[PDB]
Symmetry: C2
Subunit: 177 residues, 2 copies
């Protein structure tokens, strides 16, 4: 119900490139194959506020197609999207400072398999004793996998699930955005 | 039916300043009293195409509320707006190169009066004989009056009407956007 401070916000488009930005936030997007998608996403801060429409490029989306949820500052825009992933309602958004990469978490692997579990809470690549979880799957996300690199290490999006692992030592995000 | 060429278009916001631009077009806007409005509008070209929503900042407005009509490249945005004036369906948009000013046409005057005629076709400040029409009125537009400065001289928006003058002497716009 509250917009973020538009006085310190910016956005820009030029040809096939775009960006939404603030001193604690940066989302860089391109157009590839006629589709706009995120290539850069950095957050130094977690806050519950909404990107003002006055500073939004191409307001468009079915909200579920956004990547960064609207309630924590994600621009309601076609530019805020990653093909193969849907809105990260329970993403690791509190693990700031964060950056998104298209890259396997260290020591892990992700396979696309329709038999994999569906979307769940975002999960860290390491257990609560710092042991790496080697094998992950997703039903239909696009490769190379989306990964969040944040304060306490590497996290996967909702789509990507841990395999062959006890649940009790998993680390999940508390975010409900 | 056809969007403009996105590869050469651009748009940007920073704080209280914004702009939409192409090699043949420039709209500069800013936020005054919590409201966004055009401060600069230059066209080097007249074309019937639509500004792609992907390259539009703050897609929002009811369309009668825009200043530059959608069908000739006007960004469907709250940034494309001048208070006191509505969509220039019959503006002098063919008189390129054009620039919009907040300024009385040379040798003329504009007064605000409820009893004046309503919106009509945009009319040149001079007659077909090069004679200047000295007095103009508008029902409720805002001062200083907007004026279009183009190829064959100075024109007024749809809201600003010529007084004490004969219809046969008047030069009007053929634009229906």
């Amino acid at each position: 119900s509250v917009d973020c401070d538009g006085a310190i916000l910016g956005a820009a488009v030029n040809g096939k490139k775009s960006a939404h930005g603030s001193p604690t936030f940066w989302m860089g997007s391109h157009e590839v194959n006629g589709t706009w998608m995120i290539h850069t996403l950095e957050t130094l801060d977690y806050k519950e506020c909404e990107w003002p429409l006055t500073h939004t490029i191409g307001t468009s989306v079915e909200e579920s197609d956004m990547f960064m949820p609207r309630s924590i500052g994600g621009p309601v825009s076609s530019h805020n999207r990653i093909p193969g992933y849907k809105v990260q309602t329970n993403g690791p958004w509190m693990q700031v400072p964060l950056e998104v990469k298209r890259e396997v978490c260290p020591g892990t692997s992700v396979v696309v398999d329709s038999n994999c579990d569906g979307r769940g809470k975002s999960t860290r690549s390491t257990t609560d004793s710092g042991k790496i979880i080697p094998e992950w799957c997703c039903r239909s996300c696009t490769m190379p996998p989306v990964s969040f690199h944040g304060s306490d290490g590497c996290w996967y999006p909702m789509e990507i699930r841990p395999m062959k692992t006890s649940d009790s030592h998993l680390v999940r995000s508390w975010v409900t955005a």
